[PDB]
Structure formats: C-alpha cells, structure tokens
C-alpha cells in the first residue's frame, strides 16, 4: 500500500486507486482470496473512488487524525 501511495503519476488515469482500495479489504487479510472475490466486490470498490513568507511558521499534525476544532485566522 505504501508503495502504491508513493507512486506519482500525472497525465494518464490509472487504477492505483482501485488496487489501493483492494488491498484494504478484510477477507484478504487471511492471506488470500478466491477467483470471484474481486468481481463480487467491484461495484463496492469502484464507488469508493504551501509556501511561507519569512517570519511565518507552520503547525503540523503530530500524527494522523480527524480535525475536530481549529483556531480562527
């Protein structure tokens, strides 16, 4: 997944999103899926698809998460 995310492609549409969505599936955490899996999950998976001027600093996220409250500008 990390590999697929760090893959930058611009200009041509790809299926990096689909594959990415596909690795996230759970049945697949068992080590394998069968010949029909990717077909019965296609529609489900198909759907699921800054500079600073001197004197300024940027407050970054310490770790991943969902923003609940932010200060005003």
């Amino acid at each position: 997944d990390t590999a697929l995310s760090e893959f930058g492609v611009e200009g041509v549409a790809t299926n990096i999103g689909f594959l990415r969505r596909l690795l996230a599936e759970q049945r697949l955490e068992t080590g394998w899926v069968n010949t029909d899996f990717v077909d019965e999950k296609l529609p489900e998976l198909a759907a699921a698809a800054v500079e600073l001027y001197p004197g300024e600093d940027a407050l970054r996220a310490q770790l991943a998460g969902t923003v609940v409250e932010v200060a005003p500008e």
């Binding site: 500079e51 600073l52 001027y53 001197p54 004197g55 300024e56």
Partner: protein, 84 residues
Amino acid sequence: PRVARHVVPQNRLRAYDVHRAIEAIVDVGSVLELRPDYGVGIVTALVRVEGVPYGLIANSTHHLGGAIDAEAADKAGDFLALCE
C-alpha cells in the same frame, strides 16, 4: 510612516516579507492581493494611498531571492495590462 523604516533588513542577505513593506506604505486595510499562490515571485495587488486606487507589483524575496521567473513574469504582465 516611521514604521516603513524597519521593514527591510540592513543585512543584505536576510530575506524579508514583502507584505510588511506594502502594508507600511498603502493605507490600512486597502490591500487586496490577487492570485497570491500563482507566480509567487511577484505580488500583484489593488491598493490605496490616501483613498486613491493604485495597482501594485513587488518582488518577493521568499522565492528565488527576488529573481523573476517565467511564471511571475507572465502574472506581472497581466496585471500591468489590467492597470493600463
């Protein structure tokens, strides 16, 4: 006015924020910078000095030391065509 005097650093190497410069000249709150995240090399803004409207362009040190690149040149060319 006396504030405009400290805007530019005496050490010719220490970069500075253009906005501090602009704000030290045009009257308070009259600045309206257009396309700030585009051709960032140069600032194009509509301002006011004693209530009169002016167009303003300015080289920003935060980019290439002030160097005018192909994109910041285009942007400034556009703004000059607007003012004219």
